[PDB]
Write a protein that binds this ligand. Sequence first.
Ligand SMILES: [Mg+2]
Ligand SMILES: [Mg+2]
Ligand SMILES: [Mg+2]
Ligand SMILES: [Mg+2]
Ligand SMILES: [Mg+2]
Ligand SMILES: [Mg+2]
Ligand SMILES: [Mg+2]
Ligand SMILES: [Mg+2]
Ligand SMILES: [Mg+2]
Ligand SMILES: [Mg+2]
Ligand SMILES: [Mg+2]
Ligand SMILES: [Mg+2]
Ligand SMILES: [Mg+2]
Ligand SMILES: [Mg+2]
Ligand SMILES: [Mg+2]
Ligand SMILES: [Mg+2]
Ligand SMILES: [Mg+2]
Ligand SMILES: [Mg+2]
Ligand SMILES: [Mg+2]
Ligand SMILES: [Mg+2]
Ligand SMILES: [Mg+2]
Ligand SMILES: [Mg+2]
Ligand SMILES: [Mg+2]
Ligand SMILES: [Mg+2]
Ligand SMILES: [Mg+2]
Ligand SMILES: [Mg+2]
Ligand SMILES: [Mg+2]
Ligand SMILES: [Mg+2]
Ligand SMILES: [Mg+2]
Ligand SMILES: [Mg+2]
Ligand SMILES: [Mg+2]
Ligand SMILES: [Mg+2]
Ligand SMILES: [Mg+2]
Ligand SMILES: [Mg+2]
Ligand SMILES: [Mg+2]
Ligand SMILES: [Mg+2]
Ligand SMILES: [Mg+2]
Ligand SMILES: [Mg+2]
Ligand SMILES: [Mg+2]
Ligand SMILES: [Mg+2]
Ligand SMILES: [Mg+2]
Ligand SMILES: [Mg+2]
Ligand SMILES: [Mg+2]
Ligand SMILES: [Mg+2]
Ligand SMILES: [Mg+2]
Ligand SMILES: [Mg+2]
Ligand SMILES: [Mg+2]
Ligand SMILES: [Mg+2]
Ligand SMILES: [Mg+2]
Ligand SMILES: [Mg+2]
Ligand SMILES: [Mg+2]
Ligand SMILES: [Mg+2]
Ligand SMILES: [Mg+2]
Ligand SMILES: [Mg+2]
Ligand SMILES: [Mg+2]
Ligand SMILES: [Mg+2]
Ligand SMILES: [Mg+2]
Ligand SMILES: [Mg+2]
Ligand SMILES: [Mg+2]
Ligand SMILES: [Mg+2]
Ligand SMILES: [Mg+2]
Ligand SMILES: [Mg+2]
Ligand SMILES: [Mg+2]
Ligand SMILES: [Mg+2]
Ligand SMILES: [Mg+2]
Ligand SMILES: [Mg+2]
Ligand SMILES: [Zn+2]
Lengths: 103, 87, 119, 70, 135, 50, 50
Amino acid sequence: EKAGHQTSAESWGTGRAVARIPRVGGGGTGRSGQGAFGNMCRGGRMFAPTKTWRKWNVKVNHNEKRYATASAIAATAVASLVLARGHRVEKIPEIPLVVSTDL
Amino acid sequence: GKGTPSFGKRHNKSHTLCNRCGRRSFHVQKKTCSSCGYPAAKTRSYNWGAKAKRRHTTGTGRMRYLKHVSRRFKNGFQTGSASKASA
Amino acid sequence: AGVKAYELRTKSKEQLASQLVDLKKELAELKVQKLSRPSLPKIKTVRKSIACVLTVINEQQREAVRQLYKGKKYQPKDLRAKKTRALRRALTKFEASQVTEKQRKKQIAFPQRKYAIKA
Amino acid sequence: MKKVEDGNILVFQVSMKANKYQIKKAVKELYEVDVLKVNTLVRPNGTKKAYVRLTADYDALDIANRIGYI
Amino acid sequence: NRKRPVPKGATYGKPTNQGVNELKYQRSLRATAEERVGRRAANLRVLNSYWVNQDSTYKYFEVILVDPQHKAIRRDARYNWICDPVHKHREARGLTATGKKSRGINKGHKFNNTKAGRRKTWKRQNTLSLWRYRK
Amino acid sequence: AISKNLPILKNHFRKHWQERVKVHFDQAGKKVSRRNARATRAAKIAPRPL
Amino acid sequence: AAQKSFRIKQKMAKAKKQNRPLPQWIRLRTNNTIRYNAKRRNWRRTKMNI
RNA sequence: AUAUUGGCGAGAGACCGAUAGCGAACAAGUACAGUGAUGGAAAGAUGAAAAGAACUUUGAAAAGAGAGUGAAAAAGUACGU
RNA sequence: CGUGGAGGUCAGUGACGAAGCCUAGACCGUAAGGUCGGGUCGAACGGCCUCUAGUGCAGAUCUUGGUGGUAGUAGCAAAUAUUCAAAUGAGAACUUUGAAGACUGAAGUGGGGAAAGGUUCCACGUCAACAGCAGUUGGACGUGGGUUAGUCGAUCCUAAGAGAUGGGGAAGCUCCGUUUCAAAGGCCUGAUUUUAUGCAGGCCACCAUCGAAAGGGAAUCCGGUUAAGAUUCCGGAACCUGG
RNA sequence: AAACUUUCAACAACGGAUCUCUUGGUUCUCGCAUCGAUGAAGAACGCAGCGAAAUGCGAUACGUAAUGUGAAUUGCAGAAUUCCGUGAAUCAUCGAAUCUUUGAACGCACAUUGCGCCCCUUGGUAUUCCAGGGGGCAUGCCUGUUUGAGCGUCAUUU
Ligand SMILES: [Mg+2]
Ligand SMILES: [Mg+2]
Ligand SMILES: [Mg+2]
Ligand SMILES: [Mg+2]
Ligand SMILES: [Mg+2]
Ligand SMILES: [Mg+2]
Ligand SMILES: [Mg+2]
Ligand SMILES: [Mg+2]
Ligand SMILES: [Mg+2]
Ligand SMILES: [Mg+2]
Ligand SMILES: [Mg+2]
Ligand SMILES: [Mg+2]
Ligand SMILES: [Mg+2]
Ligand SMILES: [Mg+2]
Ligand SMILES: [Mg+2]
Ligand SMILES: [Mg+2]
Ligand SMILES: [Mg+2]
Ligand SMILES: [Mg+2]
Ligand SMILES: [Mg+2]
Ligand SMILES: [Mg+2]
Ligand SMILES: [Mg+2]
Ligand SMILES: [Mg+2]
Ligand SMILES: [Mg+2]
Ligand SMILES: [Mg+2]
Ligand SMILES: [Mg+2]
Ligand SMILES: [Mg+2]
Ligand SMILES: [Mg+2]
Ligand SMILES: [Mg+2]
Ligand SMILES: [Mg+2]
Ligand SMILES: [Mg+2]
Ligand SMILES: [Mg+2]
Ligand SMILES: [Mg+2]
Ligand SMILES: [Mg+2]
Ligand SMILES: [Mg+2]
Ligand SMILES: [Mg+2]
Ligand SMILES: [Mg+2]
Ligand SMILES: [Mg+2]
Ligand SMILES: [Mg+2]
Ligand SMILES: [Mg+2]
Ligand SMILES: [Mg+2]
Ligand SMILES: [Mg+2]
Ligand SMILES: [Mg+2]
Ligand SMILES: [Mg+2]
Ligand SMILES: [Mg+2]
Ligand SMILES: [Mg+2]
Ligand SMILES: [Mg+2]
Ligand SMILES: [Mg+2]
Ligand SMILES: [Mg+2]
Ligand SMILES: [Mg+2]
Ligand SMILES: [Mg+2]
Ligand SMILES: [Mg+2]
Ligand SMILES: [Mg+2]
Ligand SMILES: [Mg+2]
Ligand SMILES: [Mg+2]
Ligand SMILES: [Mg+2]
Ligand SMILES: [Mg+2]
Ligand SMILES: [Mg+2]
Ligand SMILES: [Mg+2]
Ligand SMILES: [Mg+2]
Ligand SMILES: [Mg+2]
Ligand SMILES: [Mg+2]
Ligand SMILES: [Mg+2]
Ligand SMILES: [Mg+2]
Ligand SMILES: [Mg+2]
Ligand SMILES: [Mg+2]
Ligand SMILES: [Mg+2]
Ligand SMILES: [Zn+2]
């Protein structure tokens, strides 16, 4: 949150034959005079800096979720879907594939 | 001649080296230092000067004593010595 | 090469004392020689050998002082435990542990009784 | 060296903290020689240089190659 | 009162803050008295204090300090609490008697602001709380 | 400004609100903590019931 | 400055020993990436400000 | 139980990828500026390996031309593309 | 249409050459774009369904960097002035020696210093850069060398001032005050002669300190010497202070 | 018709975009509580066989001791015998030390490597002068010790 803004830069005002973007003060170094803060400016702060309190997680209705995984299960039993989904089951005995509880 | 020619007269120091912080910032007449505050009991530093602070705080130096304190504590401030093994 | 810590620990105060002067003298010797000659790594090890002697000399001297102080209430601050300015002036386990008479009497009578539910 | 082969002066880089008295004593004890006069100056590179004239009882060029250098 | 320690009365700002002469310190004179002897005897610990006398010019306080290095205290179970590092200069933080008064700390409706601590209750009720599944 | 036929909102964000924003990323994190401390309290409290 | 102080005088001596070309064998060190002394000084291009 | 843009030790990311990301991926709060408070940069990439071009020739030299190294010199410490 | 990143899938392309870049070569699309060949390259990278955004530039006297025309152009004209020859060198209008012609004309272009610089001093080597032509020269580059004190200064003193202390203000950073409403000592010295050191006469004392390399102030001169130091070294001749 | 201008192309330049890299940055989370008068943070000057830096160190100076590991370090040098060993190492760990001049900074000062005082000791005729060596003298406050002040004030000699 402090990136781009670690300057004491100011606009030089107009009348100086340069754009009014804030510029770095002092002399002695190539940073002196350069454009400061702001998105067009090399070094400056980015447009609308990314924040953490962005919404990351999404709420979903418990029942939609359930509905969701239920259809998802019902689908695991459709040879057309499981093949199209890219699994190789061209050769499995049957589907749903049940296997001895020894497993 | 408020410019070039009066610059020719600039040969008297306002500031010498400061005993405490080292900078040529020791005001001769005021007998004090603009960067570190010496000979104040305290060290000069303001909160509107995050860069200033950052430049001088702990860790920018050698940390002669303080560096080792972390390890010491890890081993519980051990008294004694290691003991030597077998064969 | 160069002396060894244990070889020196057997020696006597005044033996070590002379050991040292024998070393300063050879160091002086190599300084002069270093001049007329390109590169003298030999000098490294006496420089350190001098360190090793002085170290051990002091282990002794300190230990002595440390010993003739055993069991006495005020040791020097040199030999006192360092720790931490805080940890130093923290209450001793004794002081820490002091309970009031009223509370001695109370903790004995009604201590935290271990117990369990089910039956 | 020319101040030895002509002047009877030993030229030592001495400690920065050592004074003229202290130079005299150590030059006597380390070399078993007698000191007439000690001059000292702080070389521009931070080291101190002592100019030590010995008495006519001694020949500095002797006790020099005695020391070792030449 | 506390005369606003400002240049020539000059406030340089809105006319509300343009006062100099009728402003009162938010700590008791007693709080001042404690803190000043507490600074002088900084090896001690300020336990408490009490008024004893006053004229028009002055008020007078007796201040009860307590040595925390003195083993009579360190061994006294009723008082070794003040030996702790956590009580260094309790007067300077408003932890003495006069302090928790001025600091406005008691239960009940009258102390809604200040009792969980003025600035703290503020900062609380001035915080946006954002959960992962937004509420 | 004021326009259209909309409810009159009262969103109090005129105060450097950004300085005091608390997002609970550690919701997961402090649940685990909350447990790894109930089990570890149950351990030392012997057969007592917490 | 004619009769200087010792503090200055020392600061000077330091500064002069600092002023020298890179010890050339350093360039032979493994993984060395220093090809010159980028802190070299000169009495007429930069002052020492006491 | 609560706080925690500091300190020490860790595990991470639908973050940035050298004009981006901290000012600083580098002898960066350095070089430099200013009486002072303060201001404050630029600057990463030969090759797996220096095998960093022996030798000859032209030249006052720097270098050129051959030769040689290398998978490559359409990689020659001006050096990936 | 296109871009960075994400889930899924083509068991997708690839050192037998990924990506990238070059190409008045080819094809597809109204277009955003897509595909291919040839050259260059050298370690990665696509298509389709979906997710996501720091997602598309000609402009903002926009930001950083890089490059043009201007242009071999403006210009390199203050401060009297140069010339012959030898040497050296790969090389000489410019370096060194020699000669000539001249200037500064002691109110200096002479001989020293204060402030300031900090090695620029001196020697040897030496020309990539710098000295706005040049360079074999240099306050440049490289490597070395060099600054010697009882008497010269600082150090002592007081100046305008600066500023601890007992205090008195101030929420506090601190402000005031300097003999200040303060119990503010340091010396003569015999005793004792278990001892060189308690004691016994005792006067004296509105008293920190810092502040002058031009003010005040104890004392050195001549000759000789170095590549470069000298009222500092040598030689001789003195003087002050303390004991 | 050259030259010149312009356009395209190849090769060569200039410049450093593109692509691919990444011991860095950035944000999230988890565990922990340890600076200082036992002189901290920070500052100055030094310290290597050959170092200007960065890094590390402090006159025992890129380190001394202790412990682990077990043969390096490496630009060159040099070692080193210790390579079935109390033992390489610019290793790791670290419990013993050293730790210049400073800094809250403490005898007084400080644009000064300026100026005092005390004890022990060593030289020079020396209890008094000089020099060398070692150890010392800040302030506020608390508890205690010793020595004191006040017709503040008690009791006594007689
Ligand atoms: Mg940025
Ligand atoms: Mg003037
Ligand atoms: Mg002035
Ligand atoms: Mg101070
Ligand atoms: Mg002298
Ligand atoms: Mg105001
Ligand atoms: Mg208002
Ligand atoms: Mg109001
Ligand atoms: Mg209380
Ligand atoms: Mg309220
Ligand atoms: Mg709100
Ligand atoms: Mg508003
Ligand atoms: Mg948080
Ligand atoms: Mg519970
Ligand atoms: Mg002078
Ligand atoms: Mg100049
Ligand atoms: Mg500098
Ligand atoms: Mg870590
Ligand atoms: Mg950057
Ligand atoms: Mg850019
Ligand atoms: Mg930058
Ligand atoms: Mg500025
Ligand atoms: Mg590369
Ligand atoms: Mg590159
Ligand atoms: Mg060639
Ligand atoms: Mg190739
Ligand atoms: Mg290549
Ligand atoms: Mg080459
Ligand atoms: Mg699309
Ligand atoms: Mg598409
Ligand atoms: Mg995409
Ligand atoms: Mg992106
Ligand atoms: Mg084209
Ligand atoms: Mg390709
Ligand atoms: Mg590759
Ligand atoms: Mg999509
Ligand atoms: Mg954008
Ligand atoms: Mg553009
Ligand atoms: Mg445009
Ligand atoms: Mg031309
Ligand atoms: Mg012209
Ligand atoms: Mg003109
Ligand atoms: Mg002229
Ligand atoms: Mg001629
Ligand atoms: Mg001419
Ligand atoms: Mg004339
Ligand atoms: Mg005249
Ligand atoms: Mg020359
Ligand atoms: Mg030129
Ligand atoms: Mg030229
Ligand atoms: Mg030179
Ligand atoms: Mg004052
Ligand atoms: Mg004075
Ligand atoms: Mg005089
Ligand atoms: Mg003469
Ligand atoms: Mg006399
Ligand atoms: Mg090309
Ligand atoms: Mg890239
Ligand atoms: Mg990361
Ligand atoms: Mg210092
Ligand atoms: Mg064996
Ligand atoms: Mg030592
Ligand atoms: Mg002081
Ligand atoms: Mg001193
Ligand atoms: Mg001694
Ligand atoms: Mg008392
Ligand atoms: Zn300072």
